[PDB]
Design a protein around this ligand. Sequence first.
Ligand SMILES: OC[C@H]1O[C@@H](O[C@H]2[C@H](O)[C@@H](O)[C@H](O[C@H]3[C@H](O)[C@@H](O)[C@H](O[C@H]4[C@H](O)[C@@H](O)[C@H](O[C@H]5[C@H](O)[C@@H](O)[C@H](O)O[C@@H]5CO)O[C@@H]4CO)O[C@@H]3CO)O[C@@H]2CO)[C@H](O)[C@@H](O)[C@@H]1O
Ligand SMILES: OC[C@H]1O[C@@H](O[C@H]2[C@H](O)[C@@H](O)[C@H](O)O[C@@H]2CO)[C@H](O)[C@@H](O)[C@@H]1O
Ligand SMILES: [Ca+2]
Ligand SMILES: [Ca+2]
Length: 633
Amino acid sequence: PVVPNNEYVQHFKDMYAKIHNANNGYFSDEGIPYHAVETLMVEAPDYGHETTSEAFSYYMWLEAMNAKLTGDFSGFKKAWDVTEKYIIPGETDQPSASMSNYDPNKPATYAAEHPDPSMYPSQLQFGAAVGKDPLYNELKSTYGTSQVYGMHWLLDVDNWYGFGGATSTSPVYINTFQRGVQESCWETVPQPCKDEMKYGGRNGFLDLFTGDSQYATQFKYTNAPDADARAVQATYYAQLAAKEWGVDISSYVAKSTKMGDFLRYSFFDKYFRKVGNSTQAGTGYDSAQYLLNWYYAWGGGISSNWSWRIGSSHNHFGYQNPMAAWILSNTSDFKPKSPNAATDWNNSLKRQIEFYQWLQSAEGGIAGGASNSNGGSYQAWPAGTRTFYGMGYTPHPVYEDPGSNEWFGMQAWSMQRVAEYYYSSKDPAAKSLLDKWAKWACANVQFDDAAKKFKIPAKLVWTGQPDTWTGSYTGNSNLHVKVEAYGEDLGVAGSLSNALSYYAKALESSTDAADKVAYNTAKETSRKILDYLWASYQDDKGIAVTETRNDFKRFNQSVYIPSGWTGKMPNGDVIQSGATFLSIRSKYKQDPSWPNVEAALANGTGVDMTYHRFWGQSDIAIAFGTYGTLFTD
Ligand SMILES: OC[C@H]1O[C@@H](O[C@H]2[C@H](O)[C@@H](O)[C@H](O[C@H]3[C@H](O)[C@@H](O)[C@H](O[C@H]4[C@H](O)[C@@H](O)[C@H](O[C@H]5[C@H](O)[C@@H](O)[C@H](O)O[C@@H]5CO)O[C@@H]4CO)O[C@@H]3CO)O[C@@H]2CO)[C@H](O)[C@@H](O)[C@@H]1O
Ligand SMILES: OC[C@H]1O[C@@H](O[C@H]2[C@H](O)[C@@H](O)[C@H](O)O[C@@H]2CO)[C@H](O)[C@@H](O)[C@@H]1O
Ligand SMILES: [Ca+2]
Ligand SMILES: [Ca+2]
């Protein structure tokens, strides 16, 4: 098997070597990748040595590219082994006795989401409608268990919060976001996924978030569907390589298909309400939205046996993955064991591609998404709401502090998947979607050829709304995106290169003159991104550059705590009204970057940091490998 030998393949190999080099500090003792090498870091995780299911999926992807280029699959197997061991909840995390006591006719109890954290805890409404869960019985029959095989999104890799006790550095399942659209990462109260009431207040942390007349010890986990989908995508790339090299990784393929099987929960409305008629309880698949939603979650009792499951009514274009959907529905190797799984995924594939098209702005950037639950409490939609299969348009799904579609990264991450899907399937429904998107992307990459540097969009601003979906793209004349600021986010730049590489390669077979022009532009833009990354942005640990974090003023962000509510963090930090992000995370003041931060805050400056995010370094490496494999020039 003659593997490509050019400088881009070598750049990958060099990056791979840096990421795996012990001196650089990317991995924990368990072999778990951190969110970032640097500890003082807040953006979705709120500590740099937390990690995410996202990081695990990127780890898988990185190792898959390495296996493609070298024929060594040991690293990929290792990545899956650590995933299954540490981020997919096991027996002690989600007790089988509770999971087996699930009632698919009563999946959960309704509670409203609210526009501000001060309105929490939210009261459980036991009389409110909840639909039927149509997946549970099939999954249980297929796998012979009621337990869920999906990754939880957030892991405290070295027990930094101390929820695992005073003398442990073993990983701990934790969660943060609980209090709705206005709870930023600066406004949360971190909690253990297993709330045994050892920490927090009288009822642990539970009564900060949910209102009930009594509280029992319990576990609760939350999936990030975009990460599990990336796991499927990565494992597919690994499998192509495996057939090329004659290596058997079938049991790992089986892991990914099992995960993809459970990932179908991301197709469903939060409380299984009918799609487009959301005051009504669903009776099965009528509550299927068929996109990758913001999460599914599941939980249950520790001291006694009971359980619940929810989907999410909210959908963001940035989470979608037509590549994963295609893998699960239209390849034989990755047909999941559940009888209906491939069909469901095929329906999701079609729906996802329609979704990208519906949200494509006049300029070409993809707009936010859509929800089956206005205000997260099934409020009536305003007259004139623009819709997609009955779901109302939302410029910033789920979160507005900041808007969840303000970040340009969603554009790259998500369109990379469309591009890879398009290269793999040549689905014509994606072509114009990609053409228009690529032009916009390329128009917003600003090269400084003399310096061998560049900028790409950092923050996006949206106005207007799409035309309601009727089956074909309209050009969406009244839906607009503006680039408000540019920057040097190199991980995103890597992803963008990846997307442009697949798009160009997919156009390579076209004889149309305009396609030949688009091919040249996308390919050249990708190559220039990679060349400038390599030439100008290398440092000892990988490829990185300083970024300014003005948002770090929110270290002093007030955190809402109900009047009369008192509690403590494991380290003794007092939790009461008047709390701040920092007051309940005092160990941050022990961080080596802290003096610089507090000095910056002292003189009202923004904080300068140079970060090596595992996903960012991985996207960059993978972009090198991708360009090096698709274009053997
Ligand atoms: O407790 C006893 C009682 O439980 C009943 O059920 C309740 C349960 O108590 C509640 O906890 C549960 O609540 C969920 C909320 O409704 C839901 O909004 C919330 O959503 C969060 C999610 O927790 C969080 O992980 C998530 O994170 C994302 C980040 O935003 C992203 O940046 C990142 O990339 O990805 C993650 C996604 O993985 O944000 C979302 C949304 O903001 O989750 C709560 C639980 O975790 O509701 C249950 C039913 O309503 C039970 O029914 C009774 O029987 C029992 O007595
Ligand atoms: O939440 C999506 C994505 O966010 C990533 O962080 C971004 C952040 O959204 C943006 O505001 C900041 O300026 O840039 C960072 C990183 O480039 C985060 O790294 C991911 O974990 C997360 O999936
Ligand atoms: Ca550890
Ligand atoms: Ca807020």
